[PDB]
Design a protein around this nucleic acid. Structure first.
Ligand SMILES: [Mg+2]
Ligand SMILES: [Zn+2]
Ligand SMILES: [Zn+2]
Ligand SMILES: [Zn+2]
Ligand SMILES: [Zn+2]
Ligand SMILES: [Zn+2]
Lengths: 505, 131
RNA sequence: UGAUUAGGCUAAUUAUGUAAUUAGCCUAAUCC
């Protein structure tokens, strides 16, 4: 109506507006043509020679709610549900100069994958026959903060090449994780302005070669494809956008990120801002808040890994409990209070931070009960504690191993996604200074009814023989243990654990 | 620095047109869904004694038409995107467009939905007698 | 003499002492 916007601002240095036949809007018409009734007059005043006027792309607003068109600025919940698609995104800027003044163009685009792309300064120019998306004169921002951007003004590549490089990098990153791309941004204004150069939107589409959702668009082919079929595609189709600053943060990105993380330091580059942005988003969604009502789908062998974890756990706990003749067990981290193994009869006590059964206590662990819990063993199966006691059996995920179900996290930790999202602190061997790694072995007591192993604890192996019933069982246990170990789980036992104490049975 | 061009009320649909694969379908779906048509076009004061053709170098509106600036009724000029023509040259810019009086509620969308005749240069169905 | 937001001052227009919009300047925050 009457409130003007900075979008499509005429950044030219001309002192006068355009004629009615050439001006795109009534506001942009020169005042010598206007009348009182909001009308223009076709004066005989001479038409101008060919002109070039730089148009600003600053101030996009994707708030339209057209039916059939998906909502691209998703809320916090939808961002949490799409955590496998999170890509950090930051763009460095350059100021238009010489013939123009009043707009910024992307210079360096950085992503949380650790990749930076340097582009030539390209903007929109209105002429007397139409529009162009062409190179314009640009200047690096002044000040000591942006001194690293000065040499980059001569190292830029063409935008069509950078588009295909971005599509290829996103394909490589997100092929086995999700069908979606979610750009996590700190200030979405300039990020959206830059995304206008390489993203296309529209109705949701199907890949032309398979049944997956299409995430890339090919202008030369005018086709849609998913991540594995996007070779040579030059646009990102229907990406999501997330603004972390709108999530209730005060100050700049650096001071907000440094309050909770001290791992993502480095020189000032765009990929560093993107990594810090994604880290801050992860901390905001999965450390400050716990939305365990959200269940994530299965990408890979997660049901099999979940099955093998219990197979490893039962044997490990049984063998630990038999060796040493112990009678008491403290199961830290059991919300339900369900015992794991019950063939050696011992007394069981259950602890958890948020128990769901009155048979389970409400204890938080802070190392102070090392002497208190020393009469029996403590169990730390997938319970993260910065210092474990000597008489304990621990299973901890190694966050330095990257997989489909283990995403980068905050402060060296990682996001483990298996039916739920758990943030795990960084793996540190100093927490196991009182413990030793658990050796591989198999112990079973099922009655009996080639393979030769020195760790197969079996009554037949005492006699220098083996039976098939135990041989195939050892093979499946080997497969389960190898899957558990390859997935990233490490087992730690007390110092006095020896397999030779189990042969007395 | 610079001079403003557009109202805030128009900033939503134009932004969509800057991102969609098919801008014409995007604008038409926005309008038919109840969205507000584009405003702030260049309307011309004419004596209403014109020939009536679609596109002309001077205002040629008849008693049942209105004259608009061409660049103000082109969606690709309004959104500042590439024109879908040969060599990227707009057919509206630099000229005046005659819109029927019963369509002035949406001058841009009308230009997306109608084409002039190649013989008489009138709109088809709004002055074209080539039956 | 890069961008937006919020506040303050000035000028113009419009409406009916006061308000809205636009344009310029100052301050603060974020982005560059
Ligand atoms: Mg940055
Ligand atoms: Zn496909
Ligand atoms: Zn961090
Ligand atoms: Zn046997
Ligand atoms: Zn045009
Ligand atoms: Zn005809």
């Amino acid at each position: 109506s009457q409130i003007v916007t900075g979008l499509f601002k005429d950044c030219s240095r001309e002192t006068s507006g355009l004629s009615p036949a050439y001006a795109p809007t009534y506001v942009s018409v020169d005042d010598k043509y206007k009348t009182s009734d909001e009308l223009c007059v076709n004066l005989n005043l001479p038409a101008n020679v060919p002109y070039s006027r730089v148009i600003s792309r600053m101030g996009f607003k994707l708030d339209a709610t057209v039916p059939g068109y998906p909502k691209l600025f998703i809320t916090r919940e939808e961002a949490v549900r799409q955590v496998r698609s999170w890509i950090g995104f930051d763009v460095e800027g350059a100021h238009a100069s010489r013939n123009a003044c009043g707009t910024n163009v992307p210079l360096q685009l950085g992503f949380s994958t650790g990749v930076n792309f340097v582009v030539q300064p390209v903007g929109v120019v209105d002429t007397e026959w139409g529009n162009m998306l062409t190179g314009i004169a640009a200047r690096p921002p002044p000040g000591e903060q942006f001194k690293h951007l000065v040499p980059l003004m001569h190292k830029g590549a063409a935008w069509p090449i950078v588009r295909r490089r971005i599509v290829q990098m996103l394909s490589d990153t997100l092929d086995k994780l999700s069908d979606y791309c979610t750009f996590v941004c700190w200030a979405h204004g300039f990020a959206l302005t830059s995304a206008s150069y390489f993203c296309k939107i529209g109705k949701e589409q199907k890949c032309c070669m398979c049944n997956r959702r299409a995430a890339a668009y090919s202008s030369p082919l005018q086709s849609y494809a998913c991540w594995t079929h996007s070779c040579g595609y030059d646009y990102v189709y229907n990406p999501f956008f997330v603004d972390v600053q709108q999530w209730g943060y005060v100050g700049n990105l650096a001071t907000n990120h440094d309050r909770y993380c001290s791992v993502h330091q480095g020189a000032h580059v765009a990929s560093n801002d993107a990594i810090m942005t994604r880290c801050l988003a992860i901390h905001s969604c999965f450390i400050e808040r716990v939305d365990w009502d959200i269940e994530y789908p299965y990408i890979s062998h997660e049901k099999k890994l979940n099955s093998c974890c219990r197979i490893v756990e039962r044997n490990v706990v049984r063998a630990a409990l038999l060796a040493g003749s112990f009678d008491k067990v403290y199961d830290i981290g059991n919300p339900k209070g369900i015992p794991i193994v019950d063939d050696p009869v011992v007394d069981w006590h259950y602890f958890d931070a948020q128990p769901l059964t009155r048979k389970v206590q409400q204890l938080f662990y802070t190392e102070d009960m090392a002497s208190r819990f020393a009469d029996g063993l403590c169990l730390f199966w997938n319970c993260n504690v910065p210092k474990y006691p000597n008489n304990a059996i621990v299973c901890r995920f190694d966050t330095r191993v990257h997989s489909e179900f283990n995403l980068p996290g905050c402060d060296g930790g990682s996001l483990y996604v298996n039916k739920h999202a758990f943030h795990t602190p960084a793996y540190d061997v100093s927490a196991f200074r009182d413990l030793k790694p658990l050796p591989f072995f198999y112990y079973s007591t099922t009655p009996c009814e080639p393979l030769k192993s020195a760790v197969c604890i079996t009554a037949c192996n005492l006699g220098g023989a083996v039976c098939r019933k135990h041989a195939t069982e050892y093979r499946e246990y080997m497969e389960a243990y190898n899957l558990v170990s390859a997935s990233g789980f490490r087992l730690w036992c007390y110092k006095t654990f020896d397999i030779y104490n189990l042969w007395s049975t | 620095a610079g001079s403003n061009t557009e109202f805030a009320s128009n900033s939503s649909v134009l932004s969509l047109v800057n991102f969609t694969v098919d801008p014409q379908k995007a604008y038409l779906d926005f309008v038919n869904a109840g969205g507000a048509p584009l405003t702030n076009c260049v309307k011309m004061l004419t004596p209403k004694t014109g020939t009536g053709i679609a596109i002309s170098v001077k205002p040629e509106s008849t008693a049942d038409q209105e004259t608009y600036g061409g660049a103000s009724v082109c969606l690709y000029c309004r959104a500042h995107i590439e024109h879908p023509d040969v060599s990227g040259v707009c057919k509206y810019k630099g000229k005046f467009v005659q819109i029927p009086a019963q369509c002035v509620r949406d001058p841009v969308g009308f230009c997306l939905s109608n084409t002039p005749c190649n013989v008489c240069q009138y709109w088809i169905g709004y002055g074209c007698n080539c039956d």
